[PDB]
Amino acid sequence: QEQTYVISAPKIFRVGASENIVIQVYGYTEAFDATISIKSYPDKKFSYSSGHVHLSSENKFQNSAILTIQPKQLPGGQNPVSYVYLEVVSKHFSKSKR
Amino acid sequence: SYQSINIPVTQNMVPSSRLLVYYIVTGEQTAELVSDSVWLNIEEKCGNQLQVHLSPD
Amino acid sequence: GGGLNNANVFHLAGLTFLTNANADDSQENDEPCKEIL
Amino acid sequence: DEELEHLRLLEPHCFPLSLVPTEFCPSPPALKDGFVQDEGTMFPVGKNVV
Amino acid sequence: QSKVRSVLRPSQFGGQPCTAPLVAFQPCIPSKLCKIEEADCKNKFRCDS
Amino acid sequence: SVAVYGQYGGQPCVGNAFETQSCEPTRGCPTEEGCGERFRCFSGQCISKS
C-alpha cells in the first residue's frame, strides 16, 4: 500500500466561492498529472469546474487546484442542489466523493 | 528533525485561524493517514487599519 | 484542535478528505459543534 | 466495442490516459470597459473564464 | 443495468448446453437518487442484522 | 502458439510458449482503494468492523 493519496477540501463547498483543493500523493517517482473536478450529482454529467495539476518530486508531489461553483451553472429552480461530486482522476487512481 | 512551520501570519489570517498537519506512512504494508490540528488566534488587526481623527483636537 | 482520529481531526478542523489510506470521514455526523473559544 | 466505450468512460485510470486536453477555445473576447481575470495561454473545452 | 436474452429452445437429450450467460450487467452512473431508506421498526429489538 | 500439436507420442514442443520484454509503459498501475470505514485484514481484504 505504498501508492496513496490525500485530497483535502472544505467540509462544505460554498456556492460561488473560490475553493482551494490540495492533493498529496505518496510513493510515486515518475512525474505524473491528475485532474481535480467538480461535477453534477448524482449524474456526474456536468462539470462545474476542473483543474489540471502536475505532481512531481519538483513539487514534492503536492499541488492544489482552485475550483469554483459559479452560481448560474447550478440548475437552481425549485430544488437547490444539495450535493455535488468532487472527483480526482489520474493515471493511477480515480475516486469521487459527494 | 523536521522543518518547523516558519511562516508569516499573512493578513488574510487576521480573523482567528486554524492549522492542520498530516502525513501518510505506508507502514509494513498498510498505509495510515496521520494528522493533527490546532487553533491560532491572530489578534484582529484590520487590513486597512483606517485611522480617523479630529485634527483640531 | 485535535480529534479522536485522523478523520475526526479533519472533521473538527472543518475539512474533509479523499484517501485510499484506510480512512474516511463518512462515519461522522455534520453536528453543530458549539465549543467556546 | 462496449468494453472500450463503457469501461474507459467509467474507469479512466484503468486505460492509457490521454489526460492533457486535445482541443481549446480561442482566447475570450475583451469587453467594453472590461477584461478577463483568468487570462492564460490555453483555454480547454468547458473551461469557465471570469 | 441489466441486459438479458431468452432461450429459444432448451437443450435436452445431450445436445450442446446454452453455454453463455442469460443476463449481463454493466456499471452505470445513475440518473435518479435512491428513495429507499431504512424503515427502522418502531419497537421490536433491531438485530444488528 | 502451437502450430501442430504433438500426437501419437510425437515429440512434444520444446521450450517456452512465452517470452517477456521490458518496456516504457503508457499506462499507470492502479492503486488499492483502502477499506475506508471497514476493517482491513492484513492481506488487504475488508470486512465489517462489527
Start-to-end Cα distance in chain F: 51
Resolution (A): 3.3
CB contacts of B2 in chain A (<8 Å) are none
What is the signed CA dihedral for D3, A86, A73, B12, rounded to 10 degrees?
A: -150
| Numbered residues of chain F with Cβ closer than 8 Å to any chain D Cβ | 26-28, 30
Q: Compute the CA torsion angle E24, E28, E32, E35 (nearest 10 deg).
A: 60
Which of A80, A65, A89, A52 shows the shortest CA–CA distance to A8? A65
Rounded Cα distance between F43 and E35, Å, is 36
How far does chain A reach from its first CA to its final CA, in angstroms? 25
- For residue E18 the three cell numbers come to 446454452
CA distance C20 to D11: 16
Taking the CA atoms of chain A, what radius of gyration do you get in angstroms? 14
Cβ contact E33–A43 (<8 Å): no
Separation between Cα atoms, residue F43 and residue A62, nearest integer Å: 29
Cβ of B33 within 8 Å of Cβ of C17? The answer is yes
- Cell numbers given for F20: 517477456
Contact E22, E4 (CB under 8 A): yes
With the C-alpha atoms ordered C20, C21, C24, C25, is the resulting torsion angle positive or negative? Answer: negative
Alpha helices in A1-98 (DSSP H): none
Beta strands in chain D (DSSP E): 24-25, 43-44
Please tell me which residue of chain B has the smallest CA distance to F40. Answer: B30
Cβ atoms of A49 and A69 within 8 Å: the answer is: yes
State the Cα–Cα distance between residues C12 and C29, nearest whole angstrom.
Answer: 11
For the record, the C-alpha cell of B7 comes out as 511562516
* Element at E4 (helix H, strand E): strand E2-4
Query: Could you tell me the three cell numbers for A2?
Result: 505504498
Neighbouring chains to B with at least 3 Cβ pairs closer than 8 Å: A, C, F
Taking the CA of residue B56 and the nearest CA in chain A, the distance in Å comes to 45
Chains E and A: 3 or more CB pairs within 8 Å of each other: yes
Q: Are C2 and B36 in contact (CB under 8 A)?
A: yes
Going by C-alpha positions, the residue among B8, B40, B48, B42 that lies closest to residue B21 is B40
CA distance F36 to F27: 26
On whether the CB atoms of residues A6 and C18 are closer than 8 A, the answer is yes
- Report which DSSP code applies to D14: G
Closest CA to A40 of A95, A84, A94: A84
Residues C27 and F37 sit within 8 Å (Cβ to Cβ): yes
Contact flag for F and D (3+ C-beta pairs < 8 Å)? yes
